[PDB]
Amino acid sequence: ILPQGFSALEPLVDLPIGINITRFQTLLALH
Amino acid sequence: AYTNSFTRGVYYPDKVFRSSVLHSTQDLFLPFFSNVTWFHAIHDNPVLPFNDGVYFASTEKSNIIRGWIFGTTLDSKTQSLLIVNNATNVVIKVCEFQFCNDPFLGVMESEFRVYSSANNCTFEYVSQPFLMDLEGKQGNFKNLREFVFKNIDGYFKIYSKHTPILPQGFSALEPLVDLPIGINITRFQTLLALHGAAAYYVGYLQPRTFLLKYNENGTITDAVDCALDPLSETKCTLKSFTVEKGIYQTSNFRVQPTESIVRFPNITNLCPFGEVFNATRFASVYAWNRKRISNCVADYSVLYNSASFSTFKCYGVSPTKLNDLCFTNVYADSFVIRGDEVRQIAPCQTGKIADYNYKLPDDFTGCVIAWNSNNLDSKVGGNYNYLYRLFRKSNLKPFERDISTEIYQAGSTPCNGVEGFNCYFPLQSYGFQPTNGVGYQPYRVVVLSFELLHAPATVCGPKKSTNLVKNKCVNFNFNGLTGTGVLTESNKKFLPFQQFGRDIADTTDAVRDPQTLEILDITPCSFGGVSVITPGTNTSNQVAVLYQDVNCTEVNVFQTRAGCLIGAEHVNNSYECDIPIGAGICASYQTSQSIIAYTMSLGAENSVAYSNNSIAIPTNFTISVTTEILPVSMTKTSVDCTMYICGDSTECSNLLLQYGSFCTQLNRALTGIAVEQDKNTQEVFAQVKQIYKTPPIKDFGGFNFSQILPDPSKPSKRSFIEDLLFNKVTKFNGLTVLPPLLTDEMIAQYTSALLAGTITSGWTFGAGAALQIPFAMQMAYRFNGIGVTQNVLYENQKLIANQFNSAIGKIQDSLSSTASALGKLQDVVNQNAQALNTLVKQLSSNFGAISSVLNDILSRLDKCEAEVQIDRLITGRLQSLQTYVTQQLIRAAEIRASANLAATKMSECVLGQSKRVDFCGKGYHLMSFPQSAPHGVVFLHVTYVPAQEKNFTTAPAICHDGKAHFPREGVFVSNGTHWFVTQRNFYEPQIITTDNTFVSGNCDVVIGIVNNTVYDP
Amino acid sequence: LNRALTGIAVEQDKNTQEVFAQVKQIYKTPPIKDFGGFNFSQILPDPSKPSKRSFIEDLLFNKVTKFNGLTVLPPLLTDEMIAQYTSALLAGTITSGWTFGAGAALQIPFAMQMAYRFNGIGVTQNVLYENQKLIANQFNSAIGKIQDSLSSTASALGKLQDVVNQNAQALNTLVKQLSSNFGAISSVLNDILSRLDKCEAEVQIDRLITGRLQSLQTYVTQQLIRAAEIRASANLAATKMSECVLGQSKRVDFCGKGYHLMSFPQSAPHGVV
Amino acid sequence: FLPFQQFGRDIADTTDAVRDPQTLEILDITPCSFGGVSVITPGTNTSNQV
Amino acid sequence: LVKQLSSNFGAISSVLNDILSRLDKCEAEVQIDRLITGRLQSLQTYVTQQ
């Protein structure tokens, strides 16, 4: 390069984690 | 030496009596006209292979041929069947026989050396005595003794036929004893006696379909080998031994693969199953382990053949196919459970294991492997290292794990650190002791979860790969995905995670080769329908074959766009179409004689001598009579859906009630049809309010109607022609035919009334009352109605009557000669009979049931298990009826349209005179006459056809005194010296006067105006 | 089912034969087109084409637009043969009026043919001759508008295109049905066989058949009904050909709006104009 | 029936005739007479006689 | 067409909600496909007749 346009997302690894996920967080780095 | 098997090797397929019926069966028979090896023996006999069954025959004069030997090695290492017929007592033994280098029985007999030992013998049978030839005696052969020997699932079936006398002829072989020998037979030998010439014949069976024709006495008298040649294939396809001229679709050509192609990823490392199945420690079921198996060669036959497993259930897959199939990944979910809980590790189970500790998807593909444990997983004082989840607030989703030591508040008491009432731990542990019962001892269970292929495969079975061959039809297997087709290079670009391509039908369009990452298109190898082009079998049995939409290279020989036609010679000359091929090509049987193929002619080439001042005016005419045949009705069938589906069975009827109103709505539809058949008949014939009669004296101006009016001397007052029509057109399963409301006599009376009205009153009986008129005057009006002045009839009345009478005579001669005249009504009859015959035969179908006979199910199964087989038969008999009824409704609609057309013609052709071109026959319509016919009506259309013409010069108008004179009716013509005005459809020149022409304008506007004079009376 | 579809294919050729092949001979126009000012160059064959079709026919053909055991059989009468039949019908109509229908083709000047057609509608024939030049120009202009209309928008042939679309649509539906599971583990028959031994497999396969047969029965039933509709249309077309082109129709709005004079057939893909 | 044949069949695969197991004679099996029953009635506003 | 909804077609009940409220999904799948196998035929019959 939200930008305007179209793009399909390809698959990456399929991980058999088996965990019940209800929460999320992203990770940012600190200077 | 070899000979041609001249119509031999057919046996009675079963033990059911049949008569006057053609029955189709597929089993191992010797094909007609095959080559058979012929051996003769003067005064020795080779060992032959036993493929899938052998046909044997012999001609005898001294009974040299005695018996047969069957087995695999015939040397005492395996069991071997020995059959000997030594002119007196048939002896059958199954022993581990030691055979001699040259087996024989002496001929007075002085030897017995067919075998040398008996050991570990399992079967012996000896028949009663008889007498046969025993001495050496020469001459000509008197007894042909034919046999068939085959082994199906351990039953050794012997068929035979004895007849007085390869000879030409036909003879079916009846069954003899059925012996449960259970031996794998790969080899054969015959047995000859040693001292006299004694020939015998050996043939071989291949899987064939045969059509057997049973005669009136129930003996098979002929047969068609449905896989012999195109004519036999056509005969078998139509279930008849006679084929009419035309083109039939009998089969489908399919190119077969030449070699198999097996392609797999080139990995040779073996998969770590031992570290899973023989692991030191299994995880607990609340915290089961999941090892991913990838990048290896797996072998599930070792795990499968091993007897150590207690239970083995595969869902979606079968254990013997796992060796060929391969996967993107395999997961081994490993844990220990209690024995009685093994049942819960399965799709669609619930319980303390299935909901809380290990849930499988209900759409699960893979295998559940389990075995008991009592060495490792159990101790004295119990094994308390195994924990399971005993309480959870909600169940588990498929393959979710959830480790948690949070003490479970069963109620509303928030204990939050201390166990109590309604506050327990979710993890519980049961112990395992060697003294516990079967259901409470530990079992080690591993479930193998398979992801079936959608991505590059990494876990494949021990099946070895092969080399790849391009541009040939092959039977391929790419990573477990199988199919047949030609592999070619392609220019498609699969992106790296995509392995397979698909077509609209979800079939594979292209694949990426697992060894070399290139894209290969998969196009199934060329195929197409095969049509047989044949003259009727009463002329010739020679045929031509059309291979549809192929070039013939893939298959004297002529390539057309309909396909490549073989056996028909291409002829440059065009003719009228006979047997259509397609794409403009027709074939026929012509001249010694052979089948020809040609481009269809569209008619003779003609040009019209057009000019701006030339008109052709007819000078003579012909009265023609043509026959138009229309269906009016079809047989009023009625089907009792209950007796058909559930004949005389309460159990079935009660099951049928679970399908609701399907019966009464089918009975309703058929009733509606039967009613419309009577309405159709009523609309076509009953439009006349009174029954009219002709006078006893037939003074109709020379027109002879004696062949269309009723003849009082018959038991049914039909016309002569009607009798001819009736002589040309030709129930205990709940299927009936209702009679029509209007009998043939009543129809004849209606047509008689219509004819008498037409003859004596013209069109007046249609509009209102029948007003008598002389027939000649009626014709005068009909001629006037077509633009021919009435005087033409009167001046030529005698000629016209003779032409009419002659035309009628030709109709009788035509109708009296060939059967094909009534084909439109006969096809309707044939279609209805055919629909019913199909419907009746469908009762013989199983539809997946154990038997087509409903009573045989009920007499063998108790009601509850029986319910499945019976609903399955209903599920098929109902479809057969729905198909039949739907086809009848569509066909009835076609008949209704035809009947409506017939009624329209009756109204406009017979009752009036039609100005609609070619509606009431070709030519200018005069009159029509109805005649009845079986399930239809025949109209005799009387038409005026111009016969002879001359070239006359014309002009659109004539100038006189500067005025332009135009015809009132007719055209101006000139014979080269004088101008006349005449009627268009009959040359009759008249002097041009002011009373035949009219004046409008001035002769300076009109294109083509000519000079003349007009006489003024 | 093979029988029902064969019956349909046969009726498609009979329908074509009934509409176009009612003339016993192949007629031809003279090389000199002296038809009283009526210009037929746009409906008569032009010898310079690889297929002897009229200009308008080419316009019609430019507007109307297999490995699962599904095939299409060719018609018996090729487009060229249809064009020859329509050419013969046009040449007959132009040079002999209605006489070629009843019997032999009797030549007549075109202007006289029109004189009869005008007389047939209650207009005295002198009206044509006095106004013959005007009439020819209006005819020629009307023909030009037909080409311009046909040459401009795609929608002119919608009745034939819908038939084509319906048949393609029926086949596309039929092909897609092979992708359906019908309760089976997989829509791909080979994938069932390569994974299950015969006996357990028998259930999945009968289940797929139980659905592929229904798809065919539905298709065939719809084709029989649609074929009946086409047959009715073909019968109507044959009736018009007989009463509109070969004769002159007194039936109101049967052969177009207005008082009918003449009609001209032109071939089109899977139909007649 | 020829000696190994015990049963006969119709087109519908129903039995047409059987050979009696005690006396080896052939007996035809024709299902006993049956047929539809139709009710002929004036409308019920006139009469309930049928 | 409306009455055909009351038919069982071999199922335990003609009422779809009564199957779902009584059987878990997996065993239920058989009874439901069985009801569909019949409601579809009823519609196909209706549509064909129409």
Ligand SMILES: *[C@@H]1O[C@H](CO)[C@@H](O[C@@H]2O[C@H](CO)[C@@H](O)[C@H](O)[C@H]2NC(C)=O)[C@H](O)[C@H]1NC(C)=O
């Ligand atoms: C029946 O017996 C024959 C022996 O005549 C078996 O054929 C042998 O099969 C093995 C395995 O493929 C080959 O290595 C041998 O060479 C074959 N023998 C001959 C003479 O060719 C046959 O497999 C047996 N069939 C069954 C089902 O047991």
Ligand SMILES: *[C@@H]1O[C@H](CO)[C@@H](O[C@@H]2O[C@H](CO)[C@@H](O)[C@H](O)[C@H]2NC(C)=O)[C@H](O)[C@H]1NC(C)=O
């Ligand atoms: C019109 O045609 C009819 C036959 O269609 C002619 O009648 C024939 O005349 C010849 C004389 O040359 C006789 O030999 C035949 O026997 C007649 N046949 C019949 C059936 O009558 C008639 O003469 C023709 N008229 C004209 C004027 O040409």
Ligand SMILES: *[C@@H]1O[C@H](CO)[C@@H](O[C@@H]2O[C@H](CO)[C@@H](O)[C@H](O)[C@H]2NC(C)=O)[C@H](O)[C@H]1NC(C)=O
């Ligand atoms: C109407 O035609 C029939 C023939 O279809 C005539 O009957 C024939 O008459 C002749 C006498 O001229 C007999 O020799 C034939 O045997 C009769 N045939 C039949 C079948 O009856 C009948 O005479 C004709 N009508 C008139 C008034 O002449």
Ligand SMILES: *[C@@H]1O[C@H](CO)[C@@H](O[C@@H]2O[C@H](CO)[C@@H](O)[C@H](O)[C@H]2NC(C)=O)[C@H](O)[C@H]1NC(C)=O
């Ligand atoms: C055109 O028709 C007229 C009228 O019949 C013919 O004139 C007659 O010819 C015959 C002999 O040729 C004479 O005997 C008559 O007297 C003529 N009629 C009159 C009124 O003069 C004329 O010949 C015909 N022309 C041709 C070329 O056939």
Ligand SMILES: *[C@@H]1O[C@H](CO)[C@@H](O[C@@H]2O[C@H](CO)[C@@H](O)[C@H](O)[C@H]2NC(C)=O)[C@H](O)[C@H]1NC(C)=O
């Ligand atoms: C028909 O006759 C008329 C009158 O006799 C002709 O009219 C004459 O035509 C010539 C040549 O075109 C003119 O020069 C005269 O002036 C015309 N006279 C009149 C009174 O109109 C006419 O041409 C003739 N037509 C034919 C075909 O012969």
Ligand SMILES: *[C@@H]1O[C@H](CO)[C@@H](O[C@@H]2O[C@H](CO)[C@@H](O)[C@H](O)[C@H]2NC(C)=O)[C@H](O)[C@H]1NC(C)=O
């Ligand atoms: C019939 O109409 C065509 C047009 O559709 C005429 O052909 C045109 O003739 C003119 C000359 O006047 C040329 O300039 C055009 O280029 C031609 N167009 C085509 C498409 O050929 C034809 O000449 C007309 N016929 C007559 C006898 O005039």
Ligand SMILES: *[C@@H]1O[C@H](CO)[C@@H](O)[C@H](O)[C@H]1NC(C)=O
């Ligand atoms: C046996 O068949 C072969 C090939 O079909 C043929 O060439 C040979 O002549 C046949 N034997 C006899 C005796 O005709």
Ligand SMILES: *[C@@H]1O[C@H](CO)[C@@H](O)[C@H](O)[C@H]1NC(C)=O
């Ligand atoms: C044929 O073999 C049987 C086998 O037991 C024997 O009893 C019989 O005598 C033999 N027939 C001869 C030697 O003619």
Ligand SMILES: *[C@@H]1O[C@H](CO)[C@@H](O)[C@H](O)[C@H]1NC(C)=O
């Ligand atoms: C078969 O023959 C052998 C000969 O040595 C004998 O030992 C054996 O007991 C016999 N029976 C079986 C069943 O093998």
Ligand SMILES: *[C@@H]1O[C@H](CO)[C@@H](O)[C@H](O)[C@H]1NC(C)=O
């Ligand atoms: C066989 O058919 C013939 C027909 O001519 C008949 O006479 C005969 O009685 C039938 N039965 C037998 C056993 O021949």
Ligand SMILES: *[C@@H]1O[C@H](CO)[C@@H](O)[C@H](O)[C@H]1NC(C)=O
């Ligand atoms: C082994 O796999 C590689 C991968 O592309 C391939 O190139 C090579 O030819 C294979 N070897 C054999 C012997 O098939």
Ligand SMILES: *[C@@H]1O[C@H](CO)[C@@H](O)[C@H](O)[C@H]1NC(C)=O
């Ligand atoms: C487990 O051990 C036994 C005995 O050592 C062996 O026969 C078996 O093959 C092993 N399991 C696997 C998967 O190899």
Ligand SMILES: *[C@@H]1O[C@H](CO)[C@@H](O)[C@H](O)[C@H]1NC(C)=O
């Ligand atoms: C067979 O057909 C030919 C010609 O169609 C006919 O002449 C002959 O009589 C027919 N034979 C039979 C037995 O139908």
Ligand SMILES: *[C@@H]1O[C@H](CO)[C@@H](O)[C@H](O)[C@H]1NC(C)=O
């Ligand atoms: C028939 O085969 C030839 C030979 O390869 C090929 O050139 C031709 O295009 C094929 N198809 C035809 C003639 O329609």
Ligand SMILES: *[C@@H]1O[C@H](CO)[C@@H](O)[C@H](O)[C@H]1NC(C)=O
């Ligand atoms: C038929 O015509 C073709 C023209 O392409 C010619 O090649 C062929 O030899 C002709 N056949 C005969 C038998 O005259």
Ligand SMILES: *[C@@H]1O[C@H](CO)[C@@H](O)[C@H](O)[C@H]1NC(C)=O
């Ligand atoms: C009319 O004249 C043309 C040309 O002179 C000729 O070909 C045609 O056969 C003639 N017609 C008759 C019926 O004589």
